[PDB]
Amino acid sequence: LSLGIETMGGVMTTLIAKNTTIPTKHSQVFSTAEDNQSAVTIHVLQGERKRAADNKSLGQFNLDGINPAPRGMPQIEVTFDIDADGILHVSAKDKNSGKEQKITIKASSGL
């Protein structure tokens, strides 16, 4: 099923779909939004629905040492990797901090 993430403004965006010509590897329109934190917080939202809070979460993952502003001149890119089965392998990698942390969520058999 459709699976978007929580993007800036407490809102879901289907930035990648079940049938994104799988498998594939998208690496754009993905940035850390959390001014009020120093971390990234992906929430994984099954369902088609604008608001993130109104859409079926079953998944989330976090990684600390991050900012939108160059508070410590970070280096962060978050990837949308879609697997053959259509699993969303959602991955944040800090090249500056040397952190990697990544999360795998199916996008099938659900409602």
XYZ file of all heavy atoms in Angstrom:
827
model
N 0.842 -1.185 0.000
C 0.000 0.000 0.000
C 0.886 1.248 0.000
O 2.083 1.165 0.271
C -0.993 -0.050 1.163
C -2.317 0.689 0.944
C -3.507 -0.249 1.154
C -2.403 1.932 1.831
N 0.263 2.376 -0.307
C 0.960 3.650 -0.269
C 1.608 3.849 1.102
O 0.995 3.569 2.130
C 0.009 4.807 -0.580
O -0.586 4.678 -1.869
N 2.841 4.334 1.074
C 3.563 4.619 2.302
C 4.365 5.911 2.130
O 5.371 5.932 1.423
C 4.415 3.416 2.713
C 5.529 3.699 3.725
C 4.980 4.419 4.958
C 6.271 2.414 4.095
N 3.888 6.957 2.787
C 4.656 8.186 2.896
C 5.218 8.359 4.309
O 4.932 7.558 5.198
N 6.006 9.412 4.473
C 6.584 9.719 5.770
C 6.088 11.091 6.233
O 5.491 11.834 5.455
C 8.108 9.601 5.719
C 8.709 10.657 4.789
C 8.536 8.185 5.330
C 10.036 11.183 5.341
N 6.353 11.384 7.498
C 6.020 12.687 8.048
C 7.059 13.726 7.620
O 8.197 13.699 8.087
C 5.905 12.623 9.573
C 5.358 13.937 10.137
C 4.869 13.755 11.575
O 5.630 13.152 12.360
O 3.745 14.225 11.855
N 6.630 14.615 6.737
C 7.489 15.695 6.284
C 7.107 17.007 6.972
O 6.140 17.054 7.731
C 7.404 15.760 4.758
O 6.007 15.696 4.487
C 7.972 14.509 4.086
N 7.882 18.040 6.678
C 7.763 19.293 7.403
C 6.302 19.739 7.492
O 5.611 19.817 6.477
C 8.584 20.373 6.695
C 8.557 21.686 7.479
S 9.538 22.919 6.640
C 11.161 22.492 7.250
N 5.875 20.021 8.714
C 4.579 20.639 8.930
C 3.538 19.599 9.348
O 2.342 19.787 9.128
N 4.031 18.522 9.944
C 3.154 17.528 10.538
C 2.241 16.900 9.481
O 1.083 16.593 9.759
N 2.798 16.728 8.291
C 2.001 16.333 7.143
C 2.696 15.176 6.420
O 3.919 15.165 6.290
C 1.753 17.540 6.237
C 3.027 17.934 5.486
C 0.605 17.267 5.263
N 1.885 14.229 5.968
C 2.398 13.108 5.202
C 2.708 13.523 3.762
O 1.997 14.342 3.182
C 1.367 11.978 5.196
C 1.924 10.730 4.509
S 1.417 10.696 2.798
C 0.347 9.269 2.819
N 3.770 12.941 3.228
C 4.029 13.018 1.800
C 4.428 11.645 1.254
O 5.433 11.075 1.676
C 5.089 14.096 1.568
O 4.643 15.197 2.358
C 5.073 14.635 0.137
N 3.622 11.156 0.324
C 3.980 9.964 -0.425
C 5.110 10.272 -1.411
O 4.863 10.481 -2.597
C 2.714 9.431 -1.098
O 1.787 9.279 -0.027
C 2.892 8.010 -1.639
N 6.325 10.291 -0.881
C 7.478 10.685 -1.671
C 7.982 9.480 -2.468
O 8.822 9.625 -3.354
C 8.546 11.322 -0.780
C 8.257 12.747 -0.301
C 9.262 13.180 0.768
C 8.217 13.722 -1.480
N 7.447 8.317 -2.123
C 7.784 7.098 -2.837
C 6.651 6.083 -2.667
O 6.047 5.994 -1.599
C 9.150 6.574 -2.388
C 9.645 5.466 -3.319
C 9.110 6.121 -0.926
C 11.127 5.170 -3.079
N 6.397 5.344 -3.736
C 5.183 4.552 -3.826
C 5.549 3.067 -3.881
O 6.709 2.719 -4.096
C 4.373 4.996 -5.046
N 4.540 2.234 -3.681
C 4.743 0.795 -3.698
C 5.418 0.395 -5.011
O 6.356 -0.400 -5.014
C 3.424 0.065 -3.437
C 3.652 -1.201 -2.606
C 4.448 -2.240 -3.398
C 4.307 -3.631 -2.775
N 5.092 -4.623 -3.541
N 4.914 0.964 -6.096
C 5.343 0.558 -7.423
C 6.141 1.692 -8.068
O 5.858 2.092 -9.196
C 4.142 0.256 -8.322
C 3.271 -0.849 -7.719
O 3.708 -1.645 -6.904
N 2.018 -0.853 -8.163
N 7.123 2.180 -7.323
C 8.091 3.110 -7.876
C 9.105 2.368 -8.750
O 10.302 2.381 -8.466
C 8.733 3.873 -6.715
O 7.634 4.509 -6.069
C 9.610 5.033 -7.190
N 8.588 1.740 -9.796
C 9.437 1.028 -10.735
C 10.543 0.277 -9.990
O 11.727 0.517 -10.226
C 9.967 2.038 -11.753
O 8.800 2.711 -12.216
C 10.532 1.366 -13.008
N 10.119 -0.616 -9.109
C 11.036 -1.223 -8.158
C 12.018 -2.124 -8.909
O 11.774 -2.497 -10.055
C 10.261 -1.946 -7.055
C 9.904 -3.373 -7.478
C 9.026 -1.146 -6.638
C 9.062 -3.370 -8.757
N 13.141 -2.455 -8.215
C 13.593 -1.646 -7.096
C 14.237 -0.345 -7.584
O 14.580 -0.221 -8.758
C 14.559 -2.537 -6.332
C 14.967 -3.635 -7.301
C 14.004 -3.603 -8.476
N 14.382 0.589 -6.656
C 14.896 1.905 -6.994
C 15.425 2.609 -5.742
O 15.290 2.094 -4.632
C 13.785 2.681 -7.704
O 14.425 3.870 -8.155
C 12.709 3.180 -6.736
N 16.015 3.774 -5.962
C 16.796 4.425 -4.925
C 16.739 5.941 -5.124
O 17.501 6.496 -5.915
C 18.218 3.862 -4.892
C 19.046 4.527 -3.790
C 20.418 3.861 -3.657
C 21.233 4.506 -2.535
N 20.687 4.129 -1.214
N 15.830 6.568 -4.393
C 15.616 7.999 -4.530
C 16.313 8.734 -3.384
O 16.329 8.253 -2.251
C 14.122 8.319 -4.617
C 13.816 9.794 -4.730
N 14.347 10.596 -5.725
C 13.028 10.602 -3.963
C 13.892 11.829 -5.555
N 13.077 11.830 -4.462
N 16.874 9.888 -3.717
C 17.748 10.590 -2.792
C 17.594 12.102 -2.973
O 18.507 12.767 -3.460
C 19.206 10.176 -2.993
O 19.653 10.420 -4.323
N 16.433 12.598 -2.573
C 16.109 14.001 -2.778
C 14.778 14.341 -2.105
O 14.091 13.456 -1.595
C 16.072 14.342 -4.269
C 17.209 15.298 -4.640
C 17.709 15.029 -6.060
O 17.371 15.720 -7.007
N 18.533 13.990 -6.155
N 14.451 15.625 -2.126
C 13.367 16.136 -1.305
C 13.298 15.331 -0.005
O 12.250 14.780 0.332
C 12.058 16.114 -2.093
C 12.052 17.192 -3.179
C 11.801 14.730 -2.694
N 14.425 15.290 0.690
C 14.470 14.676 2.007
C 15.448 15.414 2.922
O 16.662 15.304 2.759
C 14.958 13.238 1.813
C 14.368 12.242 2.812
C 14.329 10.916 2.507
C 13.883 12.680 4.004
C 13.781 9.991 3.435
C 13.337 11.754 4.931
C 13.298 10.429 4.627
N 14.882 16.153 3.865
C 15.680 17.014 4.722
C 15.109 17.016 6.141
O 13.916 16.784 6.334
C 15.737 18.439 4.170
O 16.301 18.484 2.862
N 15.986 17.282 7.098
C 15.582 17.324 8.493
C 14.914 18.662 8.814
O 15.437 19.720 8.469
C 16.816 17.038 9.352
O 17.832 17.861 8.783
C 17.343 15.613 9.164
N 13.768 18.573 9.474
C 12.867 19.707 9.567
C 12.860 20.232 11.003
O 12.337 21.313 11.272
C 11.473 19.295 9.091
N 13.448 19.442 11.891
C 13.181 19.584 13.312
C 14.083 20.661 13.917
O 15.172 20.362 14.404
C 13.358 18.249 14.039
C 12.379 17.201 13.506
C 13.054 16.295 12.475
O 13.746 16.851 11.595
O 12.865 15.064 12.591
N 13.599 21.893 13.865
C 14.360 23.020 14.376
C 14.470 22.906 15.898
O 15.458 23.344 16.486
C 13.668 24.345 14.050
C 12.281 24.519 14.672
O 11.574 23.494 14.782
O 11.957 25.675 15.022
N 13.443 22.315 16.492
C 13.269 22.387 17.931
C 13.939 21.174 18.584
O 13.905 21.025 19.803
C 11.787 22.367 18.310
C 11.073 21.175 17.669
O 10.950 20.108 18.248
N 10.612 21.415 16.446
N 14.530 20.342 17.740
C 15.310 19.215 18.225
C 16.785 19.397 17.865
O 17.185 20.453 17.376
C 14.768 17.896 17.671
C 13.276 17.747 17.970
C 12.762 16.376 17.529
O 13.446 15.368 17.622
N 11.522 16.389 17.048
N 17.557 18.349 18.118
C 18.828 18.172 17.435
C 18.927 16.752 16.876
O 19.970 16.109 16.989
C 20.002 18.458 18.372
O 19.973 17.628 19.531
N 17.829 16.304 16.285
C 17.726 14.923 15.846
C 16.725 14.834 14.692
O 15.983 15.780 14.435
C 17.334 14.037 17.029
N 16.735 13.685 14.029
C 15.763 13.417 12.984
C 14.785 12.344 13.467
O 15.175 11.416 14.175
C 16.480 13.031 11.688
C 17.451 11.871 11.923
C 15.476 12.692 10.586
N 13.533 12.507 13.066
C 12.482 11.602 13.503
C 11.545 11.273 12.340
O 10.598 12.011 12.074
C 11.771 12.241 14.696
O 11.268 13.471 14.181
C 12.743 12.668 15.798
N 11.841 10.164 11.676
C 10.956 9.650 10.646
C 9.801 8.892 11.304
O 10.020 8.073 12.195
C 11.742 8.814 9.632
C 12.266 9.690 8.492
C 10.902 7.645 9.117
C 13.368 10.629 8.984
N 8.598 9.190 10.839
C 7.449 8.355 11.144
C 6.897 7.749 9.852
O 6.764 8.440 8.844
C 6.396 9.145 11.925
C 6.931 9.826 13.161
N 6.808 9.284 14.429
C 7.593 11.009 13.311
C 7.373 10.114 15.295
N 7.859 11.181 14.600
N 6.591 6.461 9.924
C 6.265 5.701 8.729
C 4.749 5.503 8.654
O 4.159 4.868 9.526
C 7.041 4.383 8.720
C 6.137 3.217 8.315
C 8.264 4.474 7.804
N 4.164 6.060 7.603
C 2.728 6.282 7.577
C 2.114 5.483 6.427
O 2.222 5.876 5.266
C 2.419 7.780 7.521
C 3.293 8.679 8.398
C 3.148 10.146 7.994
C 2.990 8.460 9.881
N 1.481 4.376 6.789
C 0.659 3.641 5.842
C -0.700 4.324 5.679
O -1.286 4.789 6.655
C 0.491 2.185 6.278
C -0.408 1.420 5.304
C -1.848 1.364 5.816
O -2.710 2.126 5.408
N -2.061 0.422 6.730
N -1.161 4.363 4.437
C -2.444 4.974 4.135
C -2.268 6.215 3.258
O -1.196 6.819 3.239
N -3.335 6.560 2.552
C -3.343 7.769 1.748
C -4.151 8.866 2.446
O -5.376 8.784 2.526
C -3.890 7.493 0.347
C -3.335 8.496 -0.666
C -1.896 8.148 -1.051
O -1.733 7.177 -1.820
O -0.992 8.862 -0.567
N -3.433 9.865 2.935
C -4.041 10.883 3.775
C -3.052 12.024 4.029
O -1.876 11.781 4.296
C -4.488 10.297 5.116
C -5.994 10.470 5.316
C -6.351 11.940 5.552
N -7.551 12.040 6.409
C -7.680 12.902 7.426
N -6.947 14.023 7.450
N -8.542 12.644 8.420
N -3.566 13.241 3.937
C -2.710 14.416 3.932
C -1.993 14.523 5.280
O -0.767 14.472 5.340
C -3.515 15.663 3.563
C -2.640 16.918 3.623
C -3.266 18.061 2.821
C -2.861 17.982 1.347
N -1.514 18.562 1.148
N -2.792 14.670 6.329
C -2.247 14.813 7.668
C -1.565 13.514 8.106
O -2.069 12.423 7.837
C -3.345 15.167 8.674
C -3.704 16.652 8.593
C -4.783 17.012 9.614
N -5.034 18.471 9.595
C -5.902 19.096 10.402
N -6.622 18.389 11.284
N -6.049 20.425 10.328
N -0.432 13.673 8.771
C 0.353 12.528 9.201
C -0.328 11.873 10.404
O -0.212 10.664 10.605
C 1.782 12.975 9.509
N -1.022 12.699 11.173
C -1.616 12.240 12.417
C -2.930 11.517 12.114
O -3.525 10.905 12.998
C -1.811 13.430 13.359
N -3.343 11.609 10.858
C -4.615 11.043 10.444
C -4.360 9.824 9.557
O -5.265 9.352 8.869
C -5.434 12.053 9.638
C -5.791 13.340 10.384
O -4.985 13.733 11.255
O -6.862 13.900 10.068
N -3.125 9.348 9.600
C -2.701 8.283 8.707
C -1.984 7.201 9.514
O -1.403 7.484 10.562
C -1.728 8.807 7.649
C -1.766 7.936 6.389
O -2.775 7.346 6.043
N -0.613 7.890 5.729
N -2.046 5.983 8.998
C -1.828 4.806 9.824
C -0.325 4.588 10.008
O 0.324 3.963 9.170
C -2.557 3.596 9.237
C -4.061 3.858 9.137
C -4.770 2.715 8.407
C -6.284 2.932 8.384
N -6.949 1.868 7.603
N 0.187 5.118 11.109
C 1.559 4.848 11.503
C 1.668 3.437 12.085
O 0.734 2.949 12.717
C 2.056 5.881 12.515
O 1.362 5.788 13.757
N 2.819 2.823 11.851
C 3.111 1.529 12.443
C 4.615 1.416 12.700
O 5.125 0.328 12.960
C 2.550 0.403 11.574
C 3.026 0.378 10.119
C 2.493 1.586 9.347
C 4.551 0.276 10.044
N 5.282 2.558 12.620
C 6.720 2.571 12.411
C 7.300 3.961 12.674
O 6.681 4.971 12.340
N 8.483 3.971 13.272
C 9.244 5.201 13.406
C 10.689 4.891 13.803
O 10.963 3.852 14.400
C 8.589 6.144 14.417
C 8.445 5.469 15.783
C 7.646 6.349 16.747
O 6.840 7.174 16.352
N 7.914 6.125 18.030
N 11.576 5.810 13.454
C 12.980 5.667 13.798
C 13.668 7.031 13.881
O 13.291 7.964 13.172
C 13.633 4.848 12.683
C 14.506 5.672 11.734
C 15.802 5.928 12.054
C 13.985 6.150 10.572
C 16.614 6.693 11.174
C 14.795 6.914 9.693
C 16.092 7.170 10.012
N 14.662 7.106 14.753
C 15.239 8.386 15.124
C 16.765 8.296 15.044
O 17.328 7.204 15.105
C 14.862 8.767 16.556
C 13.499 8.184 16.938
O 13.392 7.236 17.698
N 12.468 8.800 16.369
N 17.388 9.456 14.909
C 18.840 9.533 14.926
C 19.267 10.932 15.376
O 18.778 11.932 14.855
C 19.413 9.122 13.570
C 20.937 9.011 13.491
C 21.463 7.968 14.479
C 21.392 8.725 12.059
N 20.174 10.956 16.341
C 20.476 12.185 17.054
C 21.818 12.735 16.572
O 22.690 11.975 16.154
C 20.580 11.937 18.561
C 21.792 11.112 18.997
O 21.982 10.027 18.407
O 22.502 11.585 19.910
N 21.944 14.052 16.645
C 23.146 14.718 16.171
C 22.901 15.395 14.821
O 23.707 15.261 13.900
N 21.787 16.108 14.745
C 21.302 16.604 13.469
C 20.682 17.990 13.668
O 20.179 18.299 14.746
C 20.350 15.594 12.828
C 20.957 15.000 11.554
C 18.977 16.218 12.572
C 20.409 13.597 11.287
N 20.744 18.787 12.612
C 20.126 20.102 12.630
C 19.816 20.535 11.196
O 20.485 20.107 10.256
C 21.063 21.142 13.246
C 21.370 20.807 14.707
O 20.567 21.017 15.601
N 22.574 20.276 14.899
N 18.776 21.402 11.069
C 18.536 22.106 9.822
C 19.547 23.237 9.626
O 20.112 23.391 8.544
C 17.102 22.600 9.917
C 16.746 22.562 11.395
C 17.804 21.734 12.107
N 19.744 24.002 10.690
C 20.768 25.033 10.691
C 22.134 24.390 10.942
O 22.225 23.356 11.601
C 20.423 26.093 11.738
N 23.188 25.046 10.387
C 24.543 24.539 10.529
C 25.079 24.796 11.938
O 26.075 25.498 12.107
C 25.343 25.250 9.449
C 24.519 26.463 9.050
C 23.119 26.282 9.613
N 24.396 24.214 12.913
C 24.753 24.423 14.305
C 26.124 23.812 14.601
O 26.910 24.378 15.359
C 23.713 23.800 15.239
C 22.366 24.516 15.114
C 21.403 24.068 16.216
N 20.004 24.256 15.772
C 18.987 23.464 16.137
N 19.110 22.665 17.206
N 17.848 23.468 15.433
N 26.370 22.665 13.985
C 27.689 22.058 14.032
C 28.175 21.692 12.628
O 28.938 20.742 12.461
N 27.711 22.463 11.656
C 28.072 22.218 10.270
C 27.989 20.728 9.935
O 28.997 20.105 9.606
C 29.495 22.720 10.017
C 29.592 24.230 10.239
S 31.245 24.796 9.875
C 31.059 26.539 10.216
N 26.746 20.185 10.036
C 26.534 18.760 9.849
C 26.617 18.381 8.370
O 26.853 19.238 7.518
C 25.169 18.481 10.457
C 24.468 19.828 10.541
C 25.512 20.911 10.327
N 26.421 17.097 8.107
C 26.344 16.616 6.738
C 25.428 15.393 6.658
O 25.836 14.285 7.003
C 27.735 16.297 6.189
C 27.685 16.049 4.680
C 29.091 15.844 4.113
O 29.511 14.738 3.809
N 29.793 16.967 3.985
N 24.209 15.634 6.198
C 23.140 14.666 6.366
C 22.372 14.524 5.050
O 21.957 15.521 4.459
C 22.256 15.045 7.556
C 20.998 14.176 7.604
C 21.922 16.537 7.537
C 21.355 12.703 7.817
N 22.207 13.280 4.629
C 21.277 12.970 3.556
C 20.441 11.740 3.917
O 20.982 10.721 4.345
C 22.016 12.762 2.234
C 21.032 12.523 1.086
C 20.967 11.039 0.719
O 21.999 10.529 0.232
O 19.887 10.448 0.934
N 19.137 11.875 3.731
C 18.218 10.799 4.059
C 17.629 10.225 2.769
O 17.182 10.971 1.900
C 17.150 11.301 5.032
C 16.295 10.144 5.553
C 17.782 12.078 6.188
N 17.648 8.902 2.685
C 17.416 8.229 1.417
C 16.073 7.498 1.440
O 15.656 6.988 2.478
C 18.607 7.307 1.148
O 19.685 7.916 1.852
C 19.051 7.337 -0.316
N 15.432 7.471 0.280
C 14.317 6.564 0.063
C 14.731 5.390 -0.826
O 14.696 5.491 -2.051
C 13.221 7.363 -0.645
C 12.518 8.384 0.250
C 12.641 9.714 -0.007
C 11.768 7.963 1.303
C 11.987 10.661 0.823
C 11.115 8.910 2.135
C 11.238 10.239 1.877
N 15.115 4.302 -0.173
C 15.482 3.091 -0.888
C 14.302 2.117 -0.871
O 13.827 1.729 0.195
C 16.674 2.400 -0.223
C 18.037 3.030 -0.521
O 18.151 4.257 -0.312
O 18.931 2.272 -0.951
N 13.861 1.751 -2.066
C 12.770 0.803 -2.203
C 13.331 -0.554 -2.636
O 14.091 -0.637 -3.598
C 11.696 1.352 -3.143
C 10.465 1.813 -2.360
C 11.338 0.330 -4.225
C 9.584 0.623 -1.975
N 12.932 -1.584 -1.904
C 13.454 -2.919 -2.143
C 12.595 -3.615 -3.201
O 11.583 -3.073 -3.640
C 13.412 -3.764 -0.868
C 14.565 -4.758 -0.714
O 14.999 -5.291 -1.759
O 14.986 -4.964 0.444
N 13.030 -4.808 -3.580
C 12.390 -5.529 -4.667
C 10.935 -5.820 -4.291
O 10.042 -5.715 -5.131
C 13.180 -6.804 -4.969
N 10.743 -6.179 -3.031
C 9.421 -6.539 -2.549
C 8.573 -5.275 -2.405
O 7.347 -5.350 -2.329
C 9.499 -7.214 -1.178
C 10.474 -8.389 -1.090
O 11.688 -8.130 -1.230
O 9.982 -9.520 -0.884
N 9.257 -4.142 -2.375
C 8.590 -2.868 -2.159
C 8.653 -2.460 -0.686
O 7.819 -1.688 -0.217
N 9.650 -2.997 0.001
C 9.959 -2.545 1.347
C 10.625 -1.169 1.278
O 11.552 -0.962 0.497
C 10.791 -3.594 2.088
C 9.929 -4.795 2.484
C 11.503 -2.978 3.292
C 10.722 -6.099 2.371
N 10.127 -0.263 2.106
C 10.768 1.030 2.275
C 11.940 0.890 3.249
O 11.737 0.762 4.456
C 9.743 2.087 2.694
C 9.331 3.087 1.613
C 8.124 2.579 0.825
C 9.082 4.471 2.215
N 13.140 0.919 2.690
C 14.342 0.995 3.501
C 14.752 2.458 3.674
O 15.486 3.003 2.851
C 15.458 0.133 2.904
C 16.803 0.326 3.561
N 17.983 0.406 2.843
C 17.142 0.456 4.875
C 18.982 0.574 3.697
N 18.458 0.604 4.956
N 14.263 3.052 4.754
C 14.432 4.481 4.962
C 15.629 4.719 5.883
O 15.704 4.150 6.971
C 13.133 5.088 5.498
C 13.330 6.557 5.878
C 11.996 4.930 4.487
N 16.537 5.563 5.414
C 17.900 5.554 5.921
C 18.408 6.987 6.079
O 18.345 7.781 5.142
C 18.825 4.762 4.995
O 20.171 4.756 5.463
N 18.901 7.277 7.275
C 19.574 8.540 7.521
C 21.053 8.278 7.814
O 21.385 7.395 8.603
C 18.875 9.278 8.665
N 21.900 9.060 7.163
C 23.336 8.865 7.276
C 24.014 10.220 7.490
O 23.971 11.086 6.618
C 23.870 8.096 6.067
C 23.727 8.920 4.784
C 23.234 8.052 3.627
C 22.997 8.895 2.371
N 22.265 8.111 1.351
N 24.625 10.362 8.658
C 25.403 11.552 8.956
C 26.880 11.276 8.663
O 27.525 10.509 9.375
C 25.278 11.938 10.430
C 23.879 12.378 10.867
O 23.486 13.495 10.465
O 23.236 11.589 11.593
N 27.372 11.916 7.612
C 28.751 11.724 7.196
C 29.672 12.532 8.113
O 30.845 12.198 8.270
C 28.914 12.057 5.712
C 28.110 11.090 4.841
C 28.702 9.680 4.897
C 27.745 8.711 5.594
N 28.417 7.419 5.858
N 29.106 13.580 8.694
C 29.868 14.451 9.571
C 30.062 13.763 10.924
O 31.177 13.705 11.441
C 29.132 15.770 9.814
C 29.925 16.676 10.757
O 30.922 17.277 10.389
N 29.430 16.741 11.990
N 28.961 13.257 11.458
C 28.978 12.654 12.781
C 29.459 11.205 12.688
O 29.980 10.657 13.658
C 27.596 12.714 13.432
O 27.617 12.239 14.774
N 29.268 10.626 11.512
C 29.701 9.260 11.271
C 28.616 8.260 11.679
O 28.862 7.057 11.727
N 27.438 8.797 11.961
C 26.295 7.963 12.291
C 25.679 7.417 11.002
O 25.602 8.123 9.998
C 25.304 8.733 13.167
C 25.915 9.053 14.534
C 24.923 9.818 15.413
C 25.485 10.027 16.819
N 24.454 10.607 17.708
N 25.257 6.162 11.071
C 24.201 5.679 10.198
C 23.128 4.953 11.013
O 23.445 4.220 11.949
C 24.765 4.772 9.104
C 25.759 5.530 8.221
C 25.974 4.805 6.891
O 25.390 3.710 6.739
O 26.720 5.361 6.056
N 21.881 5.184 10.630
C 20.774 4.434 11.197
C 19.599 4.400 10.216
O 19.242 5.423 9.635
C 20.347 5.020 12.544
C 20.052 3.910 13.556
C 18.819 3.104 13.142
O 17.701 3.589 13.142
N 19.086 1.849 12.790
N 19.030 3.212 10.065
C 18.154 2.943 8.938
C 17.112 1.899 9.348
O 17.352 1.098 10.248
C 18.970 2.547 7.708
C 19.810 1.296 7.984
C 21.018 1.230 7.049
C 22.172 2.081 7.584
N 23.338 2.002 6.676
N 15.976 1.943 8.664
C 14.794 1.241 9.133
C 14.051 0.647 7.934
O 13.861 1.319 6.922
C 13.931 2.163 9.997
C 13.110 1.358 11.006
C 13.051 3.062 9.129
C 11.767 0.933 10.407
N 13.649 -0.605 8.089
C 12.998 -1.322 7.006
C 11.528 -1.578 7.345
O 11.217 -2.127 8.399
C 13.792 -2.602 6.740
O 14.041 -3.133 8.040
C 15.188 -2.321 6.180
N 10.663 -1.168 6.428
C 9.232 -1.332 6.623
C 8.597 -1.818 5.319
O 8.750 -1.184 4.274
C 8.614 -0.041 7.164
C 9.148 1.180 6.414
C 8.826 0.077 8.675
C 10.422 1.715 7.071
N 7.898 -2.938 5.419
C 7.135 -3.449 4.293
C 6.143 -2.380 3.829
O 5.806 -1.471 4.584
C 6.479 -4.784 4.652
C 5.471 -4.612 5.790
C 4.362 -5.662 5.705
C 3.236 -5.354 6.693
N 2.025 -6.135 6.359
N 5.704 -2.528 2.588
C 4.591 -1.738 2.089
C 3.609 -2.653 1.354
O 3.311 -2.432 0.180
C 5.122 -0.613 1.197
N 3.133 -3.658 2.073
C 2.241 -4.642 1.485
C 1.409 -5.314 2.579
O 1.785 -5.292 3.751
C 3.023 -5.692 0.694
O 3.944 -6.403 1.516
N 0.295 -5.894 2.159
C -0.619 -6.529 3.096
C -0.958 -5.561 4.231
O -0.370 -5.633 5.309
C -0.020 -7.820 3.658
O -0.872 -8.424 4.627
N -1.906 -4.679 3.951
C -2.334 -3.702 4.937
C -3.545 -2.912 4.437
O -3.958 -3.064 3.289
N -4.080 -2.087 5.325
C -5.286 -1.337 5.018
C -5.363 -0.107 5.924
O -4.883 -0.147 7.033
C -6.517 -2.243 5.105
C -7.863 -1.573 4.822
C -7.929 -1.060 3.382
C -9.024 -2.517 5.148
